[model samples]
Structure formats: structure tokens, C-alpha cells
Target: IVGGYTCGANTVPYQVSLNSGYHFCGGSLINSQWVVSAAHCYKSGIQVRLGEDNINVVEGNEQFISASKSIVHPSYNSNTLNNDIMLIKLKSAASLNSRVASISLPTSCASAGTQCLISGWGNTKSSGTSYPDVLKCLKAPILSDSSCKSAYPGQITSNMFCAGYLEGGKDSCQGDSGGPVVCSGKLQGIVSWGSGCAQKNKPGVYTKVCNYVSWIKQTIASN
Candidate 1:
């Protein structure tokens, strides 16, 4: 919604602001202590903000926690943005409440053409250098593999999926990386990369979460 409109306070309770020196990216709380995000957003000394609406102000509902460590997928290719996913381990567990709760993971793979919701505090426009103070939400329709292939010929892979408007009106822009792409109350994807924010025929690309559930399970279990 970073590219769409502002959402009500505590609407996306699982939303997290990953501060890598600043509000570098957005993330989702997958569990009390584990957060899912984009690998490309990786940076040292991450501080996470949860249960907050306005990022620059001190809200009583906000919870500030440090990321003890980050585990990026080994297969992540920076050049192609393939397997662009990462996990953040909190130094302390997040307390759950109406303003702070984890989202449900998808039980099955997300099919093409599915409608989903995206929320973040990213820029409202591609050319804009400013970020919104409040959280934003937008409804995005998942683009088919064929469409993605057509838009990005010879580049779309199984590890990634696309979602947005073909006409280019809404999308996740900068500072929205690592945000959740949710479908039917289930988390389906992670904001990854794109040609540009909300560009015509160039939908936002995301890391296919269903493709790496086993990997995430293993990593969390080991760590």
C-alpha cells in the first residue's frame, strides 16, 4: 500500500519496520521471534519496530527490538535477484497483542491470478524520494507466469512471482522491501525487486515463499 493509500492504525499488526541505519525496508512477523524479509535488504545492526503506525514518533504501542542475527538464503543471487529472501532473528521475543501479532503462513502454493494485499511505509510513487509516515495498504492481483514472462522475457524464474497492475497505478516501492504479499490471510510472498515501482506491465516481483517453506523450516530449526 506504500504505493496506494494509508491504512488504519494496527491494520497490519504483523508489519515491521527494519531500520538499517534508517527505515531501510519493511518486513512481516512470521513468528514471535522470527521475521521474514528480503535478502537484498540485508544490512548490519538492524533494529525492528513493531506495533507502531507513525515511525518517526514514539508511540506507546510500539515495540523496539534488535535483530540478533540475519540468515539470508545461500542461493540468493544479487544480480538476478533470485531467491531474494532472508530471516531475522530477534534478540528478544515479541509480545503478541491486538497491535502486534504474527501472520499465518500459506498452507499451499499461491497460484497465478490470485488477489492479495500488500502493506508498507514505502514511497507513494516511483519518482518520489519521500516515505510515508503512516502505514499504507493496497490490493494487488497476482500476475500470471505467462504475463510475467512476457513483461520480463527470459528473466522470470520459479523462485520469483509478480503482482500489480498491468496498467501501472499501484505497487511496493523503495522502503517496502521485505514486506508481506498476503492472500486470504496467508503470507504468499516477500517484496523483492522490480524494473521500477508501479511501472506499466512491469509488476513488482516477490520471492515465492511456498517454494522455500522447507528451507525456512530447516533454517529456523537449526538456528
Candidate 2:
């Protein structure tokens, strides 16, 4: 959200834009029929847009589709923002193309210090007065668990992880919720929340995708 620059067209093929009449959250295509987003991003009139980099302009490669169902994790807590991950089943399978694809799920947890990429159309600055017209992206390092816990105290739980600069300047901010945090070419985290956009020593928090691998698999299988 904060401190990211415009991304190249069709660079992140798995990126999806969520809309509730308007852009509300970001998501990742995990399969032809499933998208992974943050549960906290839920809203009425939710829909998914694939193969899109610019939200304002309708690109020829874009695919706008309705969602058949939205499955929020049963244990999601709005107060603590835990279990923020969710699944959105598209009404129909997406037509795979050069500009639209699925991201790979992590086989294991991302290690501390792993460099990751985050992209969204959220606010460009902490002031939140403006947002990007096109998709934006940035590179951030995954902070250690001990470092994250120290920064957030009791707020950082096992289900959540941290990624950003300890000195501040770069992070996912407002409107960037449910976006992908890809590490080593795998989906590692989901943009969840932060103390403030790009605040010093207050890195952005993300839903730990690895910890919920079993639940994700089970939910997908059942649905």
C-alpha cells in the first residue's frame, strides 16, 4: 500500500482485484475457481477481477466474474484480526491465459529474512488521501518472529506474521487488504493490518498462510 511503485503490465499474473461496487481489496488466484483473500475484506456485492493491472481502465485481457461463495475462516476474530484469511469461489472457472494464472501455495513456512513481493492498488502514502490508478508493487523483507513480537508485543500471534522495513517507509496500507505476499515464488502471506502505514518499527502484519495449509486444503476439498 504505502511506498510501492506502479507495477509492469501483466507482471503479477495471479493478482486479482476484489470489488464491492468499487475496489475494496486485493486477492490472488490459487486455482481456476478459487481466490484467496482476507476475511476482513468481506463486503456486499463482492466480485473478482482477473488479468487486471489498472482498475480505472478496462483492459482487453481483464475478466470480471461473480463469486459463488465466500468462505471466511470459522475462527476469524475481528477484534484481534486473527484468522483473517478466506477463500472466494468464483461462479465459473477462470479462463487461463498469458495474463491470468494461479500462484503456487507454499510447501513450507517462509524463513525469516526472506525477501518477498507485495502488490496492490492501495494508498500510495500514509496520508491515505490518494490511491493508485494502476497496480503497485514493492519488495519487503520478512522480519524475524522475535523481532515482530517485540514490535507488536502481544498483538503478533502464531497465525500472524510480519514483513517490512524496521526503519519504516515501505508497507501495505489501507485498501491493500487481502493482497499477496509472495516469497520465493510461493504465496506466503496475505496483507492483513498494520499499526499505521509505513510507521517506524511498526511493520505490516500478514496472515501466516503456512499455518493454515491444512484448513485451506480441507475447505477446498469440502467445497
Candidate 3:
């Protein structure tokens, strides 16, 4: 994440790296057998690396598991980036511990001005490529729907919300997609899209996780 600091080891136990051969996206472990990520990050042969602090090192706490199946929101729109959330069923249940665990999902929607924690290994610079070896985190506030709409104009949808500084210099960028945006310790948003990484009048847009809670539960139950 741009304009963020390195996270302490095991501080974010729910965070996971979505990898093929290397880290491409971040995700959250919602349960022993399910991970939540952005639909746009979907690809075949994904390996979920849990309990990862630094991607460059071999940490014995890490658990590498392949996806048994993936289910993207049926209504996901690539153009508008609406309903951009996805669920991945793990081949086997994760062994939860101090360094590997699941996070709680939000039961209610987060309001504007809510300070949320965003973490990832995405670009640390807005204009160039620089992925951090260790996970980075930043505290960004959620913007009001009206304000977000004003910033993005016709791009903001009910299923999407914006979070970050309006003046710039902080945001979840590329490779951060499908990562968690936790408000008050609950999963509230999923890193989805944006105009540019940490630019003026451009905040990182996220998939409104509250809007898909029912869908998530139902999908897991039926599938």
C-alpha cells in the first residue's frame, strides 16, 4: 500500500497472499475453508499463502493451500467493477493459530468517516512499481457516498465505496486488489478499483462487503 508502514509479524493473521507463482493479490481468510477476495483477481491455479509477513522469506508459520473452487459474484461487472467480490474454497481447512486465523465479517455497513485499516503488498509508489517484501498498512477513512460520487462521477455504484485521502498520498494500489479493508475489526470492504494510486480527488474504491454478506453465506451453504 502506498504511504504505509510495514506491518508487525502476525499482526494481521487473517491476511493472505493470493499467488500463482508469486504474490499477485491479497485476500482475507473468512473461515477455515473460505477466503474472500476481489473477483477481478481471479485466476486458475491460485495458491493461498496464509500467515505470511514477508513474501521474500520462508516463514514456518505460513500455510500454502490451493483453491478447491472459486465463485465470483454472478452479477460482477468488469466495466463498472460492481459486485467485485469473490469467494475461494480451500482444498482443506486451514489450521488456525496465533499466526493463522479468520476475521469476522461486518454485520452492518460502515458509515462515512469510519477509520479503517488497509494492508497489502501492493505498489508503495503511485507512479511506479514497488511491491514491499513485508506487508504494509495504512489507516484511511471511509468517504461519504455523495463525496465519492462527486470524485468518481458516473463510476461509483451502491456496491462500491471509496476510502483514502482526498488530497492524495495514500491508497491500496495494484497487487492489493482483493485485500481487506477492516473497520472496527470487521471486514467491511474489499480492494477493488480506483482512478490512479493515491492521486488527488481519487480515493481507492472498494467492493462494499456489507452488501454481499447474504450472498457470501448462501454461496458457501449451497456450493
Candidate 4:
């Protein structure tokens, strides 16, 4: 994350690394057996690492589990990046503890100006390779739909919302996709895309979690 600070160990227990030999994306554990991530990160042979603080070090609290099934939103559009959320069913239920747990889904939609915390191990720079070993977090406020639409023009959709500074800095970069954007301790958004790492008037766009809450619940219940 650009313009962010290293997160304290176990501070974000619900955060998980989506790995295929290495960390490629971030996700949130929504339950003992289900994880929510960006559909764009989907691939075969993905392993979910829970309770991870640093990617390079062997943290004792970490739990590595394989994904049994991955369900991408049927309406996901690659071109527009709409409905970019995905769900991964764990091969086995995670053993929850102080260092490994699930985050609650949002009960309502997050409004503009709502302060949120975004955590990830994505790039620390706008360009080049500068992925952090430890997880990083940034404080960003949600922007109004009209304001977001003005910034991106035809790109902003109802399923997407923008968050970050209009003047650049503080954003979720590459490798941060599918990560959590939490507001009031609830999962509200999923890191999906952005113009650049953190450019002026180009806030990071996220999948609106509130719009898919019922879909998530129903998927988990029937699948």
C-alpha cells in the first residue's frame, strides 16, 4: 500500500494472502470456511494463508489452507470491472483464534465520507517493484458516487466506489486486489482496480460489498 504504515502483528486477523507459490492478492475471511476476494484474482491452485503478518517470515499463527472451490460473481465484467467480487470455499474450516478469525459483513451500505481502513501487502510505490514484506494499512474515506463518477467519467458503476485522496498518495496498489476495505469493523469493499497506484483524482476503486451481501449469504448456504 502506498503511503501506509506497517500493520501490527495479528491486528488484522481476518486478512489473508491469496497465494500460488507467492502472494498475488489479499482476501478477507468471512467465515470459517469462506473467503471473499476479487474475482479478477481467480486462478487454479490457490492457497489461502491466514494470520499472516509478514510474507517472508514464518509466522507461527499462520494457517495455510487450499481452496476447495472458487465462485466468481456471474455478472463480473472484465472490461468494466463490475461485480468483481469472488468467494472461495476452504478445503477445511479455519481454526479461529486471536490471530485467525472472520470479519463481519456490512449490515448496510457505506456512505460517502465514511472513514475506512484498507490493508494489504501490495506495492509500496506507484511504479516498479516494491512489495512490502509486512502487511500495510491506510486510512481512506469513501467518496460520493457523483464525485467518483466525475473523477473516472464512464468508468464508475453502481457496483463500484472510490476511496483515497484526490491529490494522490495512500492507495491499494498491485497485488492488493481482493483485499478488505473495512468500515466500522465491517467488510464494506473489496480492492478491485484503480487508474494508478495513487494518482491525483484517481482514487482506488473497490467492489461495493453491500450490493452483494445477499449473494454471499445465499452462495454460502447452498454451496
Q: Residue by residue across 1-223, what tens digits does model 1's lDDT show?
A: 4358778898899999998667889999999999999999999999999997998888789999999999999989999999999999999999999999999887798888789989998888777677789889999888889998899998889998989988887888887889999998989999988887887888898889988889888998989
Better of 2 and 3 by TM-score: 3
Q: What is the lDDT of residue 75 in candidate 1?
A: 89
- Candidate 1 accuracy as TM-score: 0.96
lDDT by residue (146-218, candidate 3, tens digit) is 9899998888889989999999999999989999999998999999999879999999999999999999999
> What Cα-based lDDT does every candidate model obtain?
0.89, 0.92, 0.93, 0.94
Each candidate's TM vs. the true structure?
0.96, 0.98, 0.98, 0.98
Model 2 Cα lDDT, one tens digit per residue, 98-132: 89999999889998999999999888887656888
Residue-pair clash count for candidate 3:
0
Which segments of candidate 3 are over 4 A away from where they belong?
Answer: none
Instruction: Score candidate 2 by lDDT.
Output: 0.92
**Would you give me the overall lDDT of model 1?**
0.89
Q: Write the per-residue lDDT of candidate 4 for residues 1-223, one digit (tens) a residue.
A: 9999988998999999999999999999999999999999999999999999988899798899999999999999988899999999999999999889899998899999999999999999986778889999999999989889999999988999999989897799998999999999999999999988898889999999999999999999998
Off by over 4 Å in 4: none
The ten-residue window of minimal lDDT in model 3 covers 126-135
